Amino acid sequence: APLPQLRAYTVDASWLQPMAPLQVADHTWQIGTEDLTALLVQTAEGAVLLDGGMPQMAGHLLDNMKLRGVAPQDLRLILLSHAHADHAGPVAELKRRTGAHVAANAETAVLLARGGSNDLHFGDGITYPPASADRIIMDGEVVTVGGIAFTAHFMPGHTPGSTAWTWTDTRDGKPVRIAYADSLSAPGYQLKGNPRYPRLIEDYKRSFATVRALPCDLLLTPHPGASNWNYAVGSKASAEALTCNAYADAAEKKFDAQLARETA
Amino acid sequence: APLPQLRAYTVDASWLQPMAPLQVADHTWQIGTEDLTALLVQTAEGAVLLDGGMPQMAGHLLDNMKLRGVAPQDLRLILLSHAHADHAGPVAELKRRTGAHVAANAETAVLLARGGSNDLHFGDGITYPPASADRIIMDGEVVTVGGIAFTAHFMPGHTPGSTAWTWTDTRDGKPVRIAYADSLSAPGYQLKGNPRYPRLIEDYKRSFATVRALPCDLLLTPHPGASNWNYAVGSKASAEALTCNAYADAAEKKFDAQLARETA
Amino acid sequence: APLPQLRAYTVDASWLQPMAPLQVADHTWQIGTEDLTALLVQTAEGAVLLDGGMPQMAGHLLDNMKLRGVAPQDLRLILLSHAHADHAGPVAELKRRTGAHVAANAETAVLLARGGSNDLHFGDGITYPPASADRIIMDGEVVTVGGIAFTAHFMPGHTPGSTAWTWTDTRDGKPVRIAYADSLSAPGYQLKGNPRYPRLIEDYKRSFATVRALPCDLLLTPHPGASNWNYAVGSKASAEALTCNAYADAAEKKFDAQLARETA
Amino acid sequence: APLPQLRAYTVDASWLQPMAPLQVADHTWQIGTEDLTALLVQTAEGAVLLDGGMPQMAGHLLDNMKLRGVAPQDLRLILLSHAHADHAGPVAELKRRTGAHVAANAETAVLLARGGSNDLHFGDGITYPPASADRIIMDGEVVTVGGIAFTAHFMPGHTPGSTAWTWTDTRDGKPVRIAYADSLSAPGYQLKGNPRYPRLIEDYKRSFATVRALPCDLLLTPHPGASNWNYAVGSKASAEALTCNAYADAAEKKFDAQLARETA
Ligand SMILES: [Zn+2]
Ligand SMILES: [Zn+2]
Ligand SMILES: [Zn+2]
Ligand SMILES: [Zn+2]
Ligand SMILES: [Zn+2]
Ligand SMILES: [Zn+2]
Ligand SMILES: [Zn+2]
Ligand SMILES: [Zn+2]
């Protein structure tokens, strides 16, 4: 009876279903897959990428970036919601082939540094190639690239370094406040009495109140299903999208129910 | 047609076949599997571990260490041949549960830091949890733990940081010079004109001459099949073991043949 | 007119005034200088060191550790209040000569990783040799060494990774709750509208309330003057020591006054 | 008698004497000081910087880069001879304000990672802000930026990661082979029997033979005095510059004399 072989991280097929760049705002484009959000922001001095998806998506992101007339050297910054395999996967490969820098908080940086290994809840089950953060950002810090200001809002919970990113774009000249809120889920997490995360419940609670007060007109999430986005129906993707109030309220209801049945 | 799922690193069953501690010398014990070498050296001030095997072997190494009366806190140093998934796998987990330090050269340290990702020949196919080296050793540097001196001999080839470790133990009072030579293989490596490793051929050549002149009475390798060690037959494991001269000569013949058919 | 020469970090003479190990509790010893706190905790399975002082203090700490019968290999863990040059200075040298591990939060780890460079308020004026944290701890996480449980309490302010450490020792069999609270000062810090630390004021406020509710019978600080400790008068050092209530209240008064005159 | 205060790294005044960009070739410009070489290469897709000088030179390099019409975001790559305080000083600050990447070998990367601390010969006397290498290069590896190919030649000695950089530029349409050879000196180094660098003498010897066979028409060094460059006399700076043969031969004579008097 030998030791078991290593198990690879396998996801649903729609998570790896490539799609053409779908326009969100005047300068905001979704270049990920049908069920994984990878946001591209085109400015006059470069491009900004928020998240990247699975590790095997690095080639697809460069193809859609070239579709938008963005050379690899035009990508200047990589922002992250949280450093998990399904969102920070291709960050290491993207840094090598584009010459871009990565801005993340300290908790996302140390999780990105060990490639997701030794996760607080998943252990070593979701390991991806490690990457190093070049600039450490704080809560409420502003990151400006080409005249577009990105404000970070810490919302710990899913990961200690979970971060919501807000920035104001336009839609035919009229401003639209966009909020990229991280996941508020806790799949299989032990919430009560977790020795690796003692104040996990308190962090989730303040994170729910943080998402509610976000300057938002249009909301996006790393997983489009959490915000009722349908990336496959083209221009009607934001038809039934949720607000920040409905997103945090529905997430808190699933959290309180999970906490109740975890006690019993 | 979605993107392909991630593929896990799977090895032969005998590579993960656990075995009881087999004695090599007075203070040297093999605690790995039947086809993967993990060496333990018991001194008066602590224990030294050379290599670790696959990532899923961290629990087995601690069990055999406790079999030898070595608590986790007694492990003081972790030496490596090269930082690949099948030899430096459990290093990250071993550092967390034992409180030991890792000594490796600069090239093995940077490969250990990114968990084997972005390999010169394998890319991201063999990723393991990353670990940080605590002390950088040079060629010919002596590392002493509890009166047993470990001398490092750089032999680049399989990896740029491939290292042979030599130390003198005893066998009922009589000294035995032990050489732990790294792998001299190049499975699927592009030898001629490799842009990621231009002087690969020259490094392999000087590495063959390095293994030949090693102070050795008993030779061991990360893979016991390369040195004709049979870990399964108990005390007759070193029956038909090779010398350093025969090991480097047979490895060079397979290298020259690989180089000849690669040209054509 | 050439560019100015580099300026070294120079402190008061009493900060580098070596002293003999002064006993704080049954297992707690102060082994730093007269004006810099370096705490040593002797257990049955090893020793724990909290802070280290200035970088040039690594030799003095080992001498006092040997005075207490603690060999370098007996030091197992290094805890930190915050990663500044006057408290985490010798951490890099202590890790090389003792074989110990460093436990710190993510914000202290990234500050320790760059040796205090690129400080939020000091820039590159207080650079010390960099060191790597081996274990990342969270708020309220318990670290046990030899039966003595260390609980971490995050108190951001002086640095984002400022941490108070609490542990229960004895005094001739009777328990004493010891709290090692980090500095609550802000020397020269820009509090209002700081772009590198937007929520600095809010973090200081919750940190004041955190220090107040600490399980404490005897309080210690990295700088003994902040807690009215007099390390030079021997056994009467804790004569006029402050409580956690008086320490946080007096620190908040100096913070509100600093904030008022900063506005004007 | 308190412990001594920290000593800052102080150099000659001419090492920090700023100068205007002096032209070396069609695309090569010297933008450092009068006695410290900082090379800038202007291509069609970006700029390349070789070395940077002292840590306090980051502002001067950006001013001369803006003098050449190179914005911070135009700097794409930073190459290094060796990671010492007087040559890799401003690398950390340059990476934050320019968005450039650093290419160095493994030995230069680990020395750059700890900011020059724990030097093989200098200890912690020459510490500078740490920086992380983004791409690890090998011996003979080609790095191309904007059509200009940079070939790295390892020449260990001064530091284990000492690297000579060669690239072919033009001079009014006619090609000129430029070699940027690292320092071949050993000031105060213990050459014979050094436990931190056992094969130091053998590495210096092969490094002398490496510099001799460099594809070179015009030679430059990190310190212009070693190559008889006079940065202050304008266009006649390369008047009495040495060849690669004379540079390595004169350096070997000073090495053999140092070795002889070190023995006695
Ligand atoms: Zn996730
Ligand atoms: Zn997810
Ligand atoms: Zn291998
Ligand atoms: Zn192998
Ligand atoms: Zn401080
Ligand atoms: Zn201080
Ligand atoms: Zn130097
Ligand atoms: Zn120099």
Numbering used by the authors:
A (entry chain A), B (entry chain A), C (entry chain A), D (entry chain A): 35 to 298
Task: Pull verbatim passages from the article behind this deposition.
Here, we reveal the structure, binding and cleavage of moxalactam antibiotic bound to L1 metallo-β-lactamase (MBL) from Stenotrophomonas maltophilia. The L1 uses two-zinc scaffold that is central to MBL’s activity, contributing to active site stability, substrate binding, and catalysis.
After the bond scission occurs between C-8 and N-5 atoms there are some significant distance changes, and the product settles down by binding to two zinc ions and stays bound till 4000 ms time point. The product is then stabilized and stays bound to both zinc ions.
